[model samples]
Target: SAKGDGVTDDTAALTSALNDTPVGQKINGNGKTYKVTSLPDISRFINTRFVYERIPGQPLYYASEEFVQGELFKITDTPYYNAWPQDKAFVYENVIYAPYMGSDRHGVSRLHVSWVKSGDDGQTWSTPEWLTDLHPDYPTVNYHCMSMGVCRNRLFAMIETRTLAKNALTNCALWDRPMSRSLHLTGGITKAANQRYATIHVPDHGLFVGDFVNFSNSAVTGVSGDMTVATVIDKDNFTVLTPNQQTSDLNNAGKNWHMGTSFHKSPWRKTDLGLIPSVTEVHSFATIDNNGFAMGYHQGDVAPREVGLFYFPDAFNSPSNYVRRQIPSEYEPDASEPCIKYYDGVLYLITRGTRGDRLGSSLHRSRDIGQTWESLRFPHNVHHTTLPFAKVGDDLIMFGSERAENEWEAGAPDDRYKASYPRTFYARLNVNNWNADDIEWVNITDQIYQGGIVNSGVGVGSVVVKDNYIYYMFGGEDHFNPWTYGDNSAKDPFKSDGHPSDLYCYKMKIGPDNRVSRDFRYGAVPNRAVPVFFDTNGVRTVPAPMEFTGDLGLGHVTIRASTSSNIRSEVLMEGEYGFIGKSIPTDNPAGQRIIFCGGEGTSSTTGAQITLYGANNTDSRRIVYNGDEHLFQSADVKPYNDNVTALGGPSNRFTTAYLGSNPIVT
Candidate 1:
């Protein structure tokens, strides 16, 4: 008897048989059979690399070991350093050039130009060499971070220095002569005398350069007072021509002293005159076409983030020198930040912002050479400090970290406040329409890591795009299971399990369409497969094969029917089948008799046989029937020779013979 629901005895037997096989077998349930197969695993498909690993307790990670081979640089090494302008050719004879931080770490913070010659493009580099002579005092805190470029046979470099109190000053250098010791040209300091300012050299005019300074004094006015200052440098003698009362009246208020001075007010300043002073500082600057330059810096005191502009010609003039246009305020930072770069006739700016508990980095651009602006948000969340660089082509990329949420003492285990995985991200820019609100940022790190674990709390360094590769460098304090801090000794700064700061590098190719592919990895799954089934009525099934053939490996197990014969003739069958009819035939010679031959068959060739009689002999077709009387006989049937043949025909005809009493085939 069946135990549950409507399942009968036969149904129970079929269910037991299917469960004994692999998942490919079918189970009978709910009046039908169901076959279940496994699907492909898509998560294993990707490429990635592990460029660096963190060492416990150390703050600096080994950077650029592959590019320089024997030499590696740390994130916090010495005075200050600078990578060559991504778009410019290496002025030191097609060699990749960088500047070393000044030797003097005391009162002066300066960065000197250094050169590394590369015979084979930029893949490999020679030893580094200092290329400049003028050395300024390195900033005690941040040092003299410098930027260098070469345009139209002119060499340009700018370095930022901080006063003892951290006020920002900018210096420019021009190499008018060829590659010789006498060729080094330096521009005297353009004193911003404020906390924030940026400077850049102009291409059309050798001696003429551009500078932007932020001067806003909220102490004087009850309102936010803000202004941008522009300066022009004379190449012959380092004379700074700033837009003041004297320079404003000189051109009869026609403006146009530096690059974007005419479009926006020279000496542009913004100040919040209320209780809290609005903090404004220019962090970096880049020159576009003749129209203007873009100045990147922080604005607003409580949540001073990054902002940029498209300063038009004649915009930075006298009384109303307001040529600067602001990047959309929606993308402004929740903390102090700044960035600026120019590529492919388009200007880009990097800024920081926070959405609820999530912090993010954003990129904005101007297409008409800094006239109007648009912005796009990055897909991944980043920490506070971020740096962005523009590649040679139209590609723009940015790198930053996932910051730690909680503050920690030098030598204590990390408090799990807002704990998150530290990570770095790279993205390509779309500049066709140039709107900050509509920009698209992609996460390239996932492809680079290739399912490997990533720590998102580590800080990400600024990105540098050169030739065919983009370089991302970053560092962070090691994850201190137990942390401790000591001056410079080895006694666990954050006394937990030793996790030292480390640096990582990632590279990707830029396609013609500007899309990037995943990094390379070995011994990973390439692709996944799905199983499909087909009817095999006429198809031959192979024998004893371990592997099946189809879109995916699969094969069908066949089911065959059983045959039986009993009670040869009608009159003899009726007299033997008295039990089924409940009475014996009246005319039978042996009354109340039972037939033994009609019960079971020994084999297909010697089993009980009963045939169905049709209306006519011409209409008769071979079929199986139970006779009235019990008797066993064999109807001639041959065994199927093929090992794959198991199931019978559509009408339950025995295609294969079994040899046993009451033989049953499944």
Candidate 2:
């Protein structure tokens, strides 16, 4: 029995219910809020979407409201949707592998890890394989987090776990051998005061420097956790690096210890390069072919200027290839959530803050494979908490949040801040050229929800580009915001009020054209049209005013596109109208002519033509009428007659025209 209120510790009851339930049987939450103080060690249950039919064989078009509630990975046939965090997905052999945490938001060491694979490029996924059992030795100790990478055709998993160091350094273990279903115990501990090296003895222990070792079931107060062998003492022992040395020498014995060997199908080894300091977790890791690998993370407390980058050139084989630096540098004011991606001989690094600016996001580029870096311009207020992104062609599209101005403190009106703060947004970087200023930022939540759509945080778990569309997972909560409930009192950040958080899968078009250019050739002829026909392609408007001027008279022109094939011209105009074969006289000979053809009309002016004579000619130009008879005109100058109602009116009207040599008024 479990209390459904937010205050009770419902871990034991929920754990019992989860263990008692059979596969495919749903454990309904009854829409009640349950507070879990600790993680339930359900190593027996396998959490998956495929087993529960959370994903369909074909895609479904989910509405915007549909995304607010769902256990399945959603694919909206429309534009955007809310998504749950899927963590980092690694693509190996065209298959997408991703891991997700199974515990409530609490301590990192109590988190459970599960694996899911998508064969059809994230459209569908396999069942979640419980990886918590991957560490056979640390079955009771929950994993803090697991980061996946690919090296030498094998999936590399760095599973972080720690017992004593709850919020401190959680040493990691590498996983390779397929989890049969899915670490160590009982080891002696020894260390001296103010010494970094803590030598431990385990009989017949075949270990080497840099190899990861897990220790537990020990009487030593502070040494029950995972660690790396700093130096192999002998066949029976090794020494590990520790954060703080004890005050006196304590050579404690009688404990359990394990150094795993059968994790990877192929031979793989673990190394804790002494040069890189121990951290609770490596925030991000990237594999660069077989050449090397890179890791980006903050060393301790994730505080300002604590973020650093480590590049292993020799693929972790030797610490000789190791290069380390505090990125943007220790001089920078603050940085968090660092992510590194290597593509096309260039390494991209992005973090949540710039040097001295916590409100801005910083993007850096490394040309020499993480050896060095330079800053690039990213959008302001983009809290890239996870900073997961995918590369399409020459651009990197990253998903994150439009965070409020101040993260640690409160600012702005509550309504106004809640209306727009912490919504999901994406920034695009075109890396074809190395320009720090080149970045395209778009807020997806504002575009889809018209603002006011907020998430606890929007960080992409996994991002993949398939069929020219980007698919990723992010998360959102129904309530439990840090802002006030409008009564000058802050709302509870812990209470969900019976409303659970949702995991969303968002699908977005790759490009603005969505690869529109590949469908057809530009300026291609349409059906029943000649190849020689004029096609403006998609250019339908003039950039500026059009001017046609020259010393010579304008030639005949016809507007043809709108007319039928049988009829050559709809409207034609001729300037200085003349026959082509006619010989030129001593003086200028022709004037302007215009012909209007009313093809389907029976008007009196159908097929009518009007012409104006040349300036030098005294003769009047021809005026032809089609349906009606043409008034016969002589080729002679005509004078106006003063025959108005009064002589005064006639004289005035005719004076200007009659006295002029040209009849055409200026």
Maximum-TM-score candidate: 2
Off-target runs (Cα >4 Å) in candidate 2 are: 1-87, 134-141, 163-166, 177-280, 300-304, 316-321, 330-332, 354-359, 379-381, 402-422, 432-439, 445-460, 478-499, 511-666
Which digits, one per residue and each the tens of the lDDT, describe model 1 over residues 1-666?
223221222334434544554564332232221111211111211221111112222121112112111112332222122222222223333443433332221223333444434344333334444554443443342323333344322343333333544433333111221121112222222323332222323333332223222222211111112332234433222223333321111111221221222212221121111211232443444655443344444555344443554232421122122244556766665533556677776667776543323545666667764457766765333335455565645455555443442211122233243334433444445455444343322223321111111222244244444555555544443333212223322322223332343333344444342545432333633121222233377643333324332255326732333233542323223454454322334564233332323334533344455543332323343345444454346764445684565456688676665566775545
lDDT of 2: 0.49
lDDT of 2 by residue, 271-371 (tens): 43322354535656677766457766665455434666667675534534556656666324455556777888778777655322344456777778755
Worst 10 residues of 2 by lDDT: 48-57
lDDT of each: 0.36, 0.49
TM-score of 2: 0.44
Q: Please, what is the TM-score per model? A: 0.38, 0.44
